[PDB]
Ligand binder design. Structure first.
Ligand SMILES: C[S@@+](CC[C@H](N)C(=O)[O-])C[C@H]1O[C@@H](n2cnc3c(N)ncnc32)[C@H](O)[C@@H]1O
Length: 199
C-alpha cells in the first residue's frame, strides 16, 4: 500500500509491529492493517500536495548555490529541490506515514531514497533528488557514501574511542556534504571553522 509504494525495499516485519506514537498522528490500527485518518493523513496529504504542485518547477540550465538557511528545516530541505533550486536535499521523518513524504513522491521527476536512521528506532532518513538532472541521483548516492562513512566512523569510535566522535566525523565529511547540498562556499567555510573550534 502507501508505504511499499514509496519505499519498496522495506523490511517485511515492519507491518507486523504496531503503530508507534508518531504513526498514530496519521493512522489507527492494531498492527501496521491500520486505517489512514481522513483529516490527518488523506486531507492533509492532499493539501500539502497542492502546495507542492504550485511550487514545483523544472531545473535550471545550471544550479546556483543556495544558502544553508533555505534548507535548515525539513520543509525547506525538499522545497529547494522541488522548486528546482538544487538537485538534492536530505531530511528526516518520525513516521513513514508523514503526509509531506507521500505528497513529495507524487511529483514528476522527484525521487526519494528512504532508510532507517542509524542509532534510532523510529526515525527514517529521506534523500530527495531531481531525476530530471543527472546530478540528482549522483548527489543522492554520494550522500549515502558520505553518510555511511560518518556512521562507520562514529560506530567505531563509539566502540573504542568515544571522545568528540561526532565532531571528529564531521571534520571528515562535512565539507563534502556542504558541497553536495549546494551550500554557499562561504557558509561551508564558516561551518568547518565551527567544527574546528569544537577541537
Ligand atoms: C545536517 S545535514 C542537513 C541537510 C539539509 N536538510 C539539506 O537538505 O540540505 C547538513 C550537513 O552538511 C554539512 N555542512 C556543511 N556546511 C554546513 C553548514 N554551513 N550548515 C549546516 N551543515 C553544513 C554538515 O555535515 C551537516 O551535517
Amino acid at each position: 500500500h502507501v508505504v511499499k509504494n514509496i519505499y519498496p525495499e522495506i523490511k517485511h516485519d515492519y507491518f507486523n509491529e504496531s503503530p508507534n506514537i508518531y504513526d498514530k498522528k496519521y493512522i489507527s490500527g492494531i498492527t501496521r492493517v491500520a486505517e489512514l485518518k481522513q483529516e490527518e493523513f488523506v486531507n492533509e496529504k492532499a493539501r500539502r500536495f497542492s502546495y507542492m504542485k504550485t511550487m514545483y518547477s523544472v531545473c535550471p540550465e545550471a544550479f546556483e548555490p543556495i544558502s544553508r538557511n533555505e534548507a535548515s528545516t525539513p520543509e525547506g530541505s525538499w522545497l529547494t529541490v522541488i522548486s528546482g533550486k538544487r538537485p538534492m536535499g536530505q531530511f528526516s521523518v518520525d513516521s513513514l506515514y508523514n503526509p509531506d513524504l507521500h505528497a513529495l513522491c507524487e511529483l514528476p521527476d522527484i525521487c526519494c531514497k528512504i532508510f532507517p536512521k542509524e542509532n534510532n528506532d523510529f526515525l527514517y532518513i529521506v534523500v530527495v533528488y531531481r531525476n530530471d538532472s543527472p546530478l540528482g541521483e549522483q548527489r543522492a548516492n554520494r550522500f549515502i557514501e558520505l553518510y555511511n562513512i560518518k556512521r562507520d566512523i562514529m560506530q567505531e569510535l563509539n566502540y573504542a574511542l568515544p571522545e568528540l566522535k561526532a565532531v571528529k566525523s564531521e571534520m571528515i565529511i562535512a565539507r563534502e556534504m556542504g558541497e553536495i547540498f549546494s551550500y554557499m562556499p562561504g557558509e561551508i567555510d564558516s561551518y568547518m571553522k565551527y567544527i574546528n573550534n569544537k577541537l
